[PDB]
Structure 1
């Protein structure tokens, strides 16, 4: 094994003796060299554990670090300031000041120039964090909504150019907003140069994917593979026109990159460095669990997958310290947290909390949510959750069967009910959702639909607006970076005309992917409209959250309310939150509140609340009570 000093002197060899002396004395090299010393041992250890005595490891690493230096050398000085800032403030992600949003550039604002025009609106809403959906080249028609990448460098012409993208990031940065983009590193589209060249038998792209001669290995692999999109194909493999079979976890036009090849890592680390230099603050690590395969296993959450993401982490610690990771691990809760670490993904989506928010609206019972908040919320130091109500994807019921069993709940049966309820196939259901990927061999099913459609706003349920307010309050107050699915703040309903479009007809997720609703955004300042009610509520909660330090950090302690319909938790021993999930008034008794101060200010309603008597919460009422 080499070391940091060794590789530094080999990196410098591209300069003639005269230049070398000037480079070694410079600021950029000093910082790069210092960071090499601090972080290279982690990088070496992580890559060694995956590749071992692979002949390609040394020369790949020298090539990678040579590019890391070039990349950091070129790096704009504005970004180097954020590098130093975040290097000295690892907990920036954990501040109550952070409130995030997500949107498609096309659907929300037409193009990138239009998105830039929407930046004053984001400031009005209070956003410090904006996730922009896949921006780069993708095949015509079906492309998993941008997640089948055909070019990591060529921006979608319908969205604009790379120059427009740079202007956006710069304008966002001026407005105090972090730019967040997808790092689609598990797979490319079948029309990507790498894909074509690999399949053509170009030796330069040998083993960039997993291509098999026949069904022998596919059949063996399929024994233990989960099916993500059963509607498209069975198992995890698709057949090429020449009869060969390729690894396709998702759609058949999405080919799994082969990380068992150390050159695929270098390739993707090179793409990561490019995104860093555009000024991306947070990379959303798409489909993290799938990047390592092994016969006999589910090819999910494998030790080598975690190792590799930690290798990517070290590359950023060396060449772009500002760049943080957002893990997309939509899996078992035990496996979800294993991606969250300072040396892996600093943050990650919190599907457990999200799925239970919706569960609790359906059952009216807080049990699973309480359990999850009690035992699975707190994280290691310098890490945070991304708490959300809805997203661009379907909802999966990813609670732990083991957890639910402790509460005498059958996981399988409960998911049957949830799916039936949220697609309006249970008596008296307020939800108006659409089935997604019903699998008849596994009984599994997911749910599409917007937040507003799932709470009952489409049929004007009198309780609808209060349900949205309740859900977002919890995402905003539990601890973690809250993410708003833009459009939710005005109660945007489904695109009910999704399925008659043949490019979308087999993908029900398009139902909750509607265009900018001009009518609802026009109503946002009108307190008589649902759009206005929702908007003022969320804006108020965003304001409170950002200005009140009782929300700071990601730690919480649950408070047993002794009412099965009411959630309770405490932040920083100073903010006590209650959330009523029943559509009827519900009471927290004087007996339960004995330890609390006699009176407390409620940041939601603005009133003083007397806690030395019974406390009756209105249907779906939320309280944020300052107790210290």
Structure 2
């Protein structure tokens, strides 16, 4: 290639008053971007022409980045998202406040809770009719009309930015809705856009792939195109063909346009399936990581204030690659979801076994520089127990455990369970944190004692997430202990999707009740706030500080350490017990032997 010609193509559209800083970043990161793209598309005859054209488009979008954001790009330090004050919140814009303008007016609520990172679930234009809660995207560059306009998105991010909140948006880059403009153009016979997807005339090629592919069929017959379209998920979601550079180019531009609208974090959905190769399982392929490296390089150049987050619900042993492998470590995703920890938390609770958490943390891969975890208790999906398959087999320190038993416990399919979840290998579990922790059952039985204990269980699980390196993510309503919403059952087109059980509309009346320390919502809210408050004052919890676990011979306890000055002790049983200091080498001070009441948690500055 001809580097100067490529650099010139990029520099062209830039504003001479902002060319210097941008070009400086281009000079240090462009080579990595080019190596990645060459590895993926370099053999194409159209490569050089496509590249020169795309870089020009990239430069033009770079120029359009609002000054306030360009300033953010220049002042924000790497690793910012892993600082102690970072606290996350995940919610649907419509369920939270109806529309984007509604969300903006509720920012004070988010500020009071200490939120500094807001994940709004799919808010871009989605497929007409069924669209899987917005995950079948029809336009990556426009907000769903029922939620507002792009102007409202800009007004929202500006307002959030003022309150010190970073917006995370989903970027469903593996597939689009089958009514996306590219899909419609394909349906109309435009070969150019038909090639943006994986299409086949007969089952000839599809079968070869199927031979090695795994069930999530993987193809859906479409009459309008008269071909089998690759559809890893719902039949109305067509997998994009990332082997086509035009697809990479247009999706990178879409990402940047979203960043220019104020999006600071990207949840990269279904990245494991980005690359297709016959003979393989077409999952977690080397090329998929190369795509993410290329996308990361683009942000490093154009919008370095932004972070890339891997949405790959897999065992923590398959997560390191997302932070970049080998020479590219630190040059891919900044964040990854610690699903193993999440599932382990619930398993440990149900089984009253802290040794399961010791196992998870003791084996948690150390975070690469400027990388961190997203820790959570619940989310918009069912709890996927299968991620714990490996841990469930046990090891030298932790005896095996039954994921089937854990799932049955939470589905209240076994006698003495306090859980009120619903079953969705081992089937996942739907239900809200308060419903799974025993709060719902205690309220339905008017049992005041069982309720207080249930509150302890809920707080315990969040305390664990809050002590982790990265961003602890609260699922909307957990801070008020909201329970299940069975309303979808009595609904037209929703009774088929069991996950709505844990996708309630925000209860603002309940939200106002947080000012009442004697109420349930207020009690939960107050205890979570206390943990958030303490977390923010502990430099030892920053993402660049070590994470480890001290092995204890009492299986009911879990000791998590951060750096060399912080220790968090947890009692996962319903019994009062104690931890001998001479077992964790301590004698420090208590934050906000050691006796732990049932389901108790204690934070200590061992130094």
TM-score, scaled relative to structure 1: 0.90
Structure 2 gaps, min length 5 = 325-329, 443-449
Equivalent runs, 1:155-554 vs 2, <5 Å: 155-228=143-216, 235-241=217-223, 244-341=227-324, 342-399=330-387, 401-407=389-395, 414-436=402-424, 443-460=425-442, 461-462=450-451, 463-554=453-544
Shift of 1:406: 4.6
Which residue number corresponds to residue 440 of structure 1? Answer: none
Against the structure 1 CA distance between its residues 57 and 335, is the aligned structure 2 distance closer, same or farther, given a 3 Å change threshold? farther
Q: Does residue 45 of the first structure (1) align with residue 35 of the second (2)?
A: yes
In structure 1, which of residues 99, 118, 121 is the aligned counterpart of residue 87 of structure 2? Answer: 99
Task: Write the deviation string for residues 485-518 of structure 1: whole angstroms up to 9, x where unpaired.
Answer: 1211001111112233242222211111000113
Instruction: Name the structure 1 match of 2:574.
Output: 583
Shift of 1:276: 1.3
Question: Which residue in the other structure is 1:17 paired with?
Answer: none
Cα pair 1:225 1:298 within 8 Å, conserved: yes
Q: Deviations over 1:217-243 (max 9, x none)?
A: 333323333333xxxxxx222222366
1:621 matched to 2:581: no
Contact 1:56-1:262 at 8 Å conserved across structures:
no
State the match for 1:64 in structure 2.
54
Report the equivalent of 1:146: 134
Contact map agreement 1:141 1:503 (CA 8 A) in 2: no
Distance 1:352 1:520 in 2: 31
- What is the Cα deviation at residue 523 of structure 1? 1.8
CA separation in 2, counterparts of 1:465 and 1:223? 49
Counterpart CA distance in 1 for 2:45 and 2:87 is: 46
1:508/1:259 Cα in 2 relative to 1: closer, same or farther (>3 Å)?
same
Measure, in 1, the Cα distance between the counterparts of 2:314 and 2:494.
Answer: 25
Does structure 1 residue 564 correspond to structure 2 residue 552? no
Which secondary structure state, in structure 2, belongs to the residue aligned with residue 146 of structure 1? coil
How far, CA to CA, are the matches of 1:477 and 1:591 in structure 2?
Answer: 22
Which residue of 1 is the match for residue 5 of structure 2? 6
Where structure 1 has 5 or more consecutive residues not aligned to the other structure, the ranges are 15-22, 229-234, 437-442
Note closer, same or farther for the CA distance 1:347–1:13 as it changes in structure 2 (3 Å cut). closer
- Distance in 2, Cα, partners of 1:414 & 1:350: 20
Q: Residue by residue, what CA displacement relative to the aligned partner does 1:304-323 show, whole Å, maximum 9, x if unpaired? A: 00000110011111111111
- State the shift of 1:11 in Å: 4.5
- Any idea what SS the aligned residue of 1:292 has? coil
The offset of 1:256, in angstroms, is 0.7
Q: Which residue of 2 aligns with 1:596?
A: 586
Between the aligned partners of 1:446 and 1:199, the Cα distance in structure 2 is: 36
Return the alpha-carbon distance in structure 2 between the equivalents of residues 48 and 500 of structure 1. 54
Please state whether the residue corresponding to 2:552 is helix, strand or coil: coil
SS of 2:36's equivalent in the other structure is helix
- The CA distance in 2 between the partners of 1:127 and 1:13, in whole Å, is 40
Contact 1:172 1:178 in 2 (8 A): yes
Closer/same/farther in 2, CA of residues 278 and 457 from structure 1, 3 Å limit: same
Q: CA offsets, 1:262-296, max 9 Å, x none?
A: 11101101101101111211111111111111122
State the shift of 1:435 in Å.
1.8
CA contact (8 A) 1:103 1:132 kept: yes
The aligned length equals 591
The DSSP-based 3-state class of the residue aligned with 1:561 is: coil
1: distance between equivalents of 2:581 and 2:104?
52
CA distance in 2, matches of 1:379, 1:13: 38
Once the two structures are TM-superposed, the CA of residue 197 in structure 1 deviates from its matched residue by 1.4
